[PDB]
């Protein structure tokens, strides 16, 4: 059934699984028309499909042309997310196909289930976890490849960079969710924490800075403080 705090270790076992987040598929700016009505203009989006064990990210870029002359776009966006995940699974060799797909939003269940009818042994699960994958587009290199796309494109990343060389997938996921939670709560302050020190760079082939083990502890502490500092403002507590 639902993935929660109770069954959290299951994310790091040897059963292939993928998180699917559809938050950034259909993205708009709302603006005024010359007549003083309101209109939306779509921008490029992405499906965020992540193997939490390996860090492998299947970033499917959703080009604005998808939406041209379509109606009920927030509804279509769930079905298009499901079409593209189903197509990804069918493209993978059998031994690479997931056993489970966990959707971060319950509205993706029926669309994904219907598109995956050909795969009755792949479980489609919701989660009770509130994962911060919406903040994916706060990661500069992911944001850049999405906005520059001129056509539908699939880009493959490791969202853990080379972390699994030094830490477990449990710890790598904890680090990723803390970074994304911070970027989601206060993007400016999170980016300042990550790039404030000029001597620490991001490798051409990486998403995040090249931090030593001790620098990661400091960064992780600064991220926790940011999230509490911000929660201190929100609620005045």
């Amino acid at each position: 059934g639902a993935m929660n705090s109770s069954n959290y270790a299951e994310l790091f076992n040897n059963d292939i699984k993928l998180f699917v987040d559809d938050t950034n598929v259909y993205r708009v700016t709302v603006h005024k028309t010359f007549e003083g009505n309101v209109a939306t203009k779509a921008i490029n989006g992405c499906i965020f499909t992540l193997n939490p064990k390996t860090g492998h990210l299947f970033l499917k870029i959703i080009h604005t042309s998808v939406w041209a002359g379509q109606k009920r776009l927030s509804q279509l966006a769930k079905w298009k997310t499901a079409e593209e995940v189903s197509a990804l699974v069918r493209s993978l060799p059998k031994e690479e196909q997931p056993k489970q797909i966990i959707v971060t939003r319950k509205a993706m269940l029926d669309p994904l289930e219907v598109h995956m009818l050909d795969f009755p042994n792949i479980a489609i699960r919701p989660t009770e976890l509130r994962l911060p994958f919406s903040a994916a587009m706060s990661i500069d290199k992911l944001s850049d490849v999405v906005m520059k796309a001129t056509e539908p494109q699939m880009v493959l990343f490791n969202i853990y960079d080379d972390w699994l060389d030094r830490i477990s997938s449990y710890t790598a996921f904890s680090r990723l969710t803390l970074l994304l939670r911070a970027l989601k709560t206060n993007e400016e302050s999170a980016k300042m924490i990550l790039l404030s020190d000029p001597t620490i760079t991001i490798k051409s082939y990486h998403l995040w800075p090249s931090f030593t083990d001790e620098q990661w502890i400091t960064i992780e502490s600064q991220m926790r403080d940011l999230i509490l500092t911000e929660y201190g403002r929100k609620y005045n507590v």
Binding site: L76, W79, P111, L117
Partner: protein, 300 residues
């Protein structure tokens, strides 16, 4: 007007005939039901006074043979049997009528209720849902499971309703996932009407038979089937106008007949709210919407 004689009533029982019912006392000199209207199916049904567990009954058509009821003290129920000897049967019925040992099917001349509930129900379709080809009449009870309930355990005792499943390859054409899921017209019109039922009359027969089994036996699988066949039409954008008009009439008489006190168990909130207020056909069921709003406003 045909007759179903009873050998005797050795156990205290509530006897149903169609929408009517009578309490019979233990060893009361009851010998059956006369004046049963020719031209419809009928259902004769039972609920023992000493064990209300297992409502059970028999669907029959008096045109297909001479049928009687006899209590079996071994299996502990009223059984239907066919009398093949025409002259023995007529002779038995004539005797019981003379001694006025039979209740009269109590049909008011103005009242089309039974016709309206069974308009599309045919014995030959019942005998394919309820498989026991040695008998011309069909046994149903409270506890019998459907083929679909059994998939999700004795095949011989199943209700073989047509399986309907909105998240099945049968319901969803490869490459038309969103279209077929949001608009079930393909599934209704091509798969079910043209494909399996052949026509709207057979589809309505099964819908009406599922309802009556749900109402008279509290058969939960039957109730699921009735709701599924309503939802499949209401969730289709493209339905022939004659089918919508007929559905409105069918559902109106089902809601009209339903005991007021069973609406909590026999009506599915989600299906009715969706069908009347959100679906493609929300504005196509005027009679059904007015009786539901006036009789069961809490459900909605």
């Amino acid at each position: 007007m045909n007759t179903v004689p009873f050998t005797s009533a050795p156990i205290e029982v509530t006897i149903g005939i169609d929408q009517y019912s009578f309490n019979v006392k233990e060893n009361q000199p009851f010998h059956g039901i006369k004046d049963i209207p020719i031209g419809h199916v009928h259902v004769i049904h039972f609920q023992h006074a000493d064990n209300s567990s297992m409502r059970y009954g028999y669907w029959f058509d008096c045109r297909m043979g001479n049928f009687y009821i006899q209590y079996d003290p071994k299996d502990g129920l009223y059984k239907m049997m066919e009398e093949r000897d025409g002259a023995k049967f007529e002779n038995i019925v004539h005797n019981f009528k003379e001694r006025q040992m039979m209740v009269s099917y109590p049909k008011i001349d103005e009242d089309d209720t039974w016709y309206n509930l069974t308009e599309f129900v045919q014995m030959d379709k019942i005998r394919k849902i309820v498989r026991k080809d040695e008998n011309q009449f069909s046994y149903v009870d409270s506890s019998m499971t459907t083929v679909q309930e059994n998939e999700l355990s004795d095949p011989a005792h199943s209700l073989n309703y047509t399986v309907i499943n909105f998240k099945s390859r049968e319901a969803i054409r490869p490459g038309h996932e969103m279209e077929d899921f949001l608009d079930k017209s393909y599934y209704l019109n091509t798969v079910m009407l043209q494909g399996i039922f052949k026509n709207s009359s057979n589809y309505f027969g099964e819908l009406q038979f599922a309802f009556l089994n749900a109402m008279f036996f509290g058969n939960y699988g039957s109730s699921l089937q009735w709701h599924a066949m309503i939802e499949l039409i209401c969730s289709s954008a493209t339905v022939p106008k004659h089918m919508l008009d007929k559905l409105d009439e069918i559902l109106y008489y089902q809601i009209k007949t339903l005991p007021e006190q069973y609406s909590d168990i026999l009506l599915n909130e989600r299906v009715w709210n969706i069908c009347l207020y959100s679906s493609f056909q929300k504005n196509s069921l005027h009679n059904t919407e007015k009786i539901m709003e006036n009789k069961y406003p809490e459900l909605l």
